[PDB]
Design an enzyme around this catalytic site. Structure first.
Site, PDB file in Angstrom:
ATOM      1  CD  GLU A   1     -19.817   1.141  60.363  1.00  0.00           C
ATOM      2  OE1 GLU A   1     -19.235   0.187  59.788  1.00  0.00           O
ATOM      3  OE2 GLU A   1     -20.858   1.024  61.068  1.00  0.00           O
TER       4      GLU A   1
ATOM      5  CD  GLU B   1     -24.495  -2.639  59.651  1.00  0.00           C
ATOM      6  OE1 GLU B   1     -24.537  -2.443  58.417  1.00  0.00           O
ATOM      7  OE2 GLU B   1     -23.578  -2.171  60.363  1.00  0.00           O
TER       8      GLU B   1
ATOM      9  N   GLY C   1     -16.626  -7.632  54.468  1.00  0.00           N
ATOM     10  CA  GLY C   1     -16.298  -6.702  53.337  1.00  0.00           C
ATOM     11  C   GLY C   1     -15.542  -5.424  53.746  1.00  0.00           C
ATOM     12  CB  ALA C   2     -15.638  -2.447  54.121  1.00  0.00           C
TER      13      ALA C   2
ATOM     14  CD  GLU D   1     -18.537  -0.275  55.344  1.00  0.00           C
ATOM     15  OE1 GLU D   1     -18.890   0.283  56.377  1.00  0.00           O
ATOM     16  OE2 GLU D   1     -18.788  -1.437  55.142  1.00  0.00           O
TER      17      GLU D   1
HETATM   18  N1  LIG Z   1     -20.655  -2.547  60.207  1.00  0.00           N
HETATM   19  C1  LIG Z   1     -19.560  -3.129  59.375  1.00  0.00           C
HETATM   20  C2  LIG Z   1     -19.002  -4.317  60.068  1.00  0.00           C
HETATM   21  C3  LIG Z   1     -17.657  -4.656  60.213  1.00  0.00           C
HETATM   22  C4  LIG Z   1     -17.342  -5.769  61.000  1.00  0.00           C
HETATM   23  C5  LIG Z   1     -18.278  -6.573  61.696  1.00  0.00           C
HETATM   24  N2  LIG Z   1     -18.086  -7.653  62.529  1.00  0.00           N
HETATM   25  C6  LIG Z   1     -19.116  -8.262  63.142  1.00  0.00           C
HETATM   26  C7  LIG Z   1     -18.561  -9.222  63.966  1.00  0.00           C
HETATM   27  C8  LIG Z   1     -17.165  -9.104  63.858  1.00  0.00           C
HETATM   28  N3  LIG Z   1     -16.839  -8.115  62.981  1.00  0.00           N
HETATM   29  C9  LIG Z   1     -19.567  -6.129  61.545  1.00  0.00           C
HETATM   30  C10 LIG Z   1     -19.925  -5.063  60.751  1.00  0.00           C
HETATM   31  P1  LIG Z   1     -20.318  -3.459  57.804  1.00  0.00           P
HETATM   32  O1  LIG Z   1     -21.883  -3.566  57.951  1.00  0.00           O
HETATM   33  O2  LIG Z   1     -19.395  -4.549  57.051  1.00  0.00           O
HETATM   34  O3  LIG Z   1     -20.198  -2.030  57.061  1.00  0.00           O
HETATM   35 ZN   LIG Z   2     -22.802  -1.765  57.581  1.00  0.00          ZN
END
Ligand SMILES: N[C@@H](c1ccc(-n2cccn2)cc1)P(=O)(O)O
Ligand SMILES: [Zn+2]
Ligand SMILES: [Mg+2]
Ligand SMILES: [Mg+2]
Length: 889
Positions: free
Chosen positions: A268, A324, A265-266, A302
């Site tokens: 931070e 998280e 999704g996004a 985020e």
């Molecule tokens: N912490 C962010 C995020 C973004 C990318 C990934 N990611 C995990 C593995 C590869 N990319 C994990 C968490 P969010 O929890 O999506 O806000």
């Molecule tokens: Zn997150």
């Protein structure tokens, strides 16, 4: 593949104090120069200097401006750069390098990559090492000074963390910007963005210190008019953290950027949040209603990471749930407060009990703090995020609002800093717990098992009422099934929010009460209970558990009508449906196995049908709640209660129960679908970009749910309603018109009409694909092949791939076709996707997670396909590790 264990954490014997980056982006390559100002830490034991660095092409490396020699002074194997210790200085020293990387052909979307005409980074968890050399772990805090150069016409907008301190022209049509970010951060929070970006902006003035904060939201030019809602969501998010937690944004600017190609999704990154376009951009003309809650929750999430992830940081990735699970909890409290609808909490519970419970009873089961990993790429799970969030939400249930806010302020005050672990959070809540109990012996030690113990606890109930004594007893029991992570499961600290409802008048008999179940079983006694009550148990869904209420359907019906807690009312209805589902499934199963020529089915409880009608007809009841009570529980929730589930027998069971209720209520459903029209579809604020009415959207959900029920039933002349609905200006309606027309000869006419309405907006075309994929069509395999040839083609956009395939995998009859052709088709897509994007390939494995829960034949069909994928010579590490763990091999 190396296995990292939580028990093995040790600090680095190096320190990186300052990173100075020059990122020069060219047509066919990006050159990255990096100087790291380093030291030897107090933990150093004379070891080799070892940098992470994946897929980097080295032009040169140096220490203190002297070139190093490949082979004699260092090796690099495309994963680790090892500088032999005899060549590593023993005081402050500079390491420099220049590498070449290729964002244009980076289709895995991790590190630095190109998404359409935008260059963008994605560093969490271990993507920074794909940009330049680093000790790429979150406890390595450094200062960052970043310069980016690119072609001015292709990349006029240049962004990275901190203050833009210089802008400058470069010969040959190029330009540059330098950004300096003095506060320390981990490297997974670095970001850079370059592109022909357009924007909207506002100024927010903080609540206490009255600082002006500039807010910028960016997209490609075509879609800049879909940014307004995101900007409103950001203002709301800042106000929330201010109002509920007393927390202000610390920086002078916050940028949100939408990209078309993104794995989740996004993300931070500090002051520079990057988003999947589908979780930032919406308009009323070109988005379905779901996009509005989605952007609000993702913008919120985020934003909240700016404290919970960014200012209080993780020491190591095992503590991931601390940032998280806690941010999801903050995100859910904000969504609940912003939407003001009961279905927001219900939808979080619906998600946990379907998807997360399935994960927690699968071979993939893990606690919210795991003890080991192999791929950080596969660690970001529903267990870590959503059960982590329920664990973080239980502190609030246990303490209440005042003391919860005190313990949180305790954690933020002490650790705004400063890495932390889950024990630090627990310590802070404990201090609030001591103060709440007003007893300093009181502790939350047993609470820690929520972090370490895997599996879903089962909580069961027996009751006693003594009418002469006015004395009511609730006997409670908890049990967690042994699994691969613990042979012996200890009792957890389980908070059970309860009420007692008088069955005569529907009234509460006691004040707010939360039972603290801390043993394998306990008996809770209440005096002065004038009449035998119906217990309202786990209000708000107060612990992430299987609830076995042992109530009769007449009691459940009474709660469903008369209880004050939305979750308990919905859960009572859920439990009536499940009792019915298991009964009819076993009757269908018996008839299929014994090859019966005739048999009987237990009809649906008549008084439960009467109670549904009573609620639907109530003009003061909530439309979102109504759409929950006419829908059967999700298939992935049902599967947790049936062994060797035959999906065809479950499809026939669901078909019978829907037809039983529809045969009584379809006239009521038709009348409501018509009388709801005026308010549901009201166009008064259609051109008001910022006016979002969650109640109105829940009316549309209801109408669209009732329309689907009416179409499946072939209610007389319903096609007239479907055709009229296709002319609605709301995409939620007109896409609904496409999926319900599956049962009629008009389907392909509406397929074409709605393709034409969708084809010129990239996100709305993705929603059209999902609508097609999920269509209840007997010719769905031919329709998929048509989307592949005509629309999807060889798109490497994960939004496109996910939209064509994931909704189809929920088609209970057809994905699970006994020939195994559906499992075959998904396996071919996963393998193809794995060539360029292992992360998304693993996401496309989701239907396989329940493989060992299905009937004998289907278990075997799915295992065959998993073994086939496992035998691909070019399998990624990520996909391999996931499927080895899933298939228990
Ligand atoms: N912490 C962010 C995020 C973004 C990318 C990934 N990611 C995990 C593995 C590869 N990319 C994990 C968490 P969010 O929890 O999506 O806000
Ligand atoms: Zn997150
Ligand atoms: Mg490379
Ligand atoms: Mg595209």
């Amino acid at each position: 593949p190396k296995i990292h264990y939580r028990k093995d954490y040790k600090p680095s014997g190096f320190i990186i104090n300052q990173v100075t980056l020059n990122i020069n982006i060219h047509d066919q390559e990006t050159i990255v120069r990096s100087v790291l100002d380093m030291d030897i830490s107090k933990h150093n034991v004379g070891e080799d200097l070892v940098f992470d660095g994946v897929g980097l092409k080295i032009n040169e490396i140096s220490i203190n401006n002297k070139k190093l020699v490949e082979g004699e002074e260092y090796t690099y194997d495309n994963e680790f750069l090892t500088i032999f210790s005899k060549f590593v200085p023993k005081s402050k020293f500079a390491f420099s390098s220049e590498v070449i990387i290729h964002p244009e052909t980076n289709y895995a979307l991790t590190g630095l990559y190109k998404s359409k005409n935008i260059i963008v980074s994605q560093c969490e968890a271990t993507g920074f090492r794909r940009i330049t050399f680093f000790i790429d772990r979150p406890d390595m805090m450094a200062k960052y000074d970043v310069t980016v150069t690119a072609d001015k016409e292709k990349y006029p907008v240049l962004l990275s963390n901190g203050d833009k301190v210089n802008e400058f022209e470069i010969p040959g049509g190029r330009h540059g910007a330098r950004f300096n970010d003095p506060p320390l951060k981990p490297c997974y929070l670095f970001a850079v963005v370059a592109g022909d970006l357009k924007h909207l902006s506002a100024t927010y003035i903080t609540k206490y210190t009255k600082k002006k904060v500039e807010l910028y939201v960016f997209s490609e030019e075509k879609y800049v008019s879909k940014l307004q809602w995101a900007l409103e969501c950001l203002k709301k998010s800042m106000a929330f953290d201010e109002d509920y937690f007393g927390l202000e944004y610390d920086l002078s600017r916050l940028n949100l950027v939408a990209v078309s190609d993104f794995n989740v999704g996004a993300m931070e990154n500090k002051g520079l949040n990057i988003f999947n376009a589908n979780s930032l951009l919406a308009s009323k003309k070109n988005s379905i209603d779901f996009s509005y809650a989605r952007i609000l929750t993702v913008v919120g999430h985020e934003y909240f990471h700016q404290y919970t992830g960014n200012r209080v940081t993780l020491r190591d990735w095992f503590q991931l749930t601390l940032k998280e699970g806690l941010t999801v909890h903050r995100e859910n409290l904000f969504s609940e407060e912003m939407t003001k609808t009961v279905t927001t909490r219900l939808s979080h519970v619906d998600l946990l009990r379907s998807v997360q419970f399935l994960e927690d009873s699968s071979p993939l089961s893990h606690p919210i703090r795991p003890e080991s990993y192999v791929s950080m790429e596969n660690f970001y799970t529903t267990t870590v995020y959503d059960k982590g969030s329920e664990v973080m939400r239980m502190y609030l249930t246990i303490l209440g609002e005042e003391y919860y806010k005190k313990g949180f302020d305790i954690y933020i005050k002490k650790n705004d800093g400063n890495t932390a672990t889950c024990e630090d959070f627990n310590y802070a809540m404990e201090q609030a717990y001591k103060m709440k109990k007003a007893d300093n012996s009181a502790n939350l030690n047993q609470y820690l098992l929520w972090f370490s113990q895997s599996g879903t606890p089962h909580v069961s109930f027996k009751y006693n009422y003594d009418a002469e004594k006015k004395q009511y007893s609730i006997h409670v029991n908890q049990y967690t099934k042994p699994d691969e992570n613990q042979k012996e499961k200890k009792p957890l600290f389980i908070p059970i929010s309860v009420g007692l409802i008088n069955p005569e008048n529907g009234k509460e008999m006691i004040s707010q009460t939360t039972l603290e179940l801390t043993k394998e079983s306990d008996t809770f006694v209440f005096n002065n209970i004038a009449v035998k009550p119906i217990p309202s148990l786990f209000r708000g869904f107060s612990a992430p558990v299987y609830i076995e209420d042992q109530l009769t359907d007449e009691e459940r019906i009474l709660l469903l009508k008369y209880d004050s807690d939305a979750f308990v009312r919905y859960n009572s209805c859920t439990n009536i449906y499940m009792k019915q589902i298991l009964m009819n499934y076993n009757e269908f199963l018996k008839a299929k196995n014994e090859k019966l020529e005739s048999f009987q089915l237990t009809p649906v409880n008549a008084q439960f049908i009467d109670a549904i009608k009573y609620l639907l007809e109530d003009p003061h009841a909530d439309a979102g709640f109504k759409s929950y009570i006419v829908s059967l529980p999700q298939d992935r929730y049902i599967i947790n209660f049936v062994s060797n589930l035959d999906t065809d027998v479950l499809a026939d069971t669901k078909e019978y129960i829907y037809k039983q209720i529809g045969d009584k209520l379809n006239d009521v459903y038709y009348k409501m679908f018509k009388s709801l029209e005026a308010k549901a579809d009201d166009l008064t604020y259609f051109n008001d970009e910022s006016h979002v009415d969650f109640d109105q959207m829940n009316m549309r959900t209801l109408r669209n749910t009732l329309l689907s029920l009416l179409s499946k039933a072939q209610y007389p002349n319903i096609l007239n309603e479907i055709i009229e609905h296709s002319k609605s200006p709301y995409p939620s309606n007109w896409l609904t018109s496409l999926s319900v027309s599956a049962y009629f000869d008009k389907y392909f006419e509406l397929y074409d009409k709605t393709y034409k309405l969708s084809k010129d907006d990239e996100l709305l075309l993705q929603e059209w694909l999902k609508t097609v994929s999920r269509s209840d069509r007997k010719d769905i395999y031919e329709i998929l092949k048509k989307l592949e040839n005509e629309v999807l083609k060889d798109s490497k956009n994960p939004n496109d791939i996910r939209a064509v395939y994931l909704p189809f995998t929920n088609n209970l009859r057809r994905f699970h076709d006994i020939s195994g052709k559906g499992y075959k088709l998904i396996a071919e897509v996963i393998t193809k996707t794995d060539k360029f994007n292992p992360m998304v390939a693993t996401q496309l494995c989701e239907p396989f997670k329940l493989w060992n829960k299905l009937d004998t034949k289907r278990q075997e069909l799915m295992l065959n396909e998993m073994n086939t994928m496992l035998q691909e010579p070019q399998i990624s590490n990520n996909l391999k590790e996931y499927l080895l763990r899933l298939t228990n091999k």
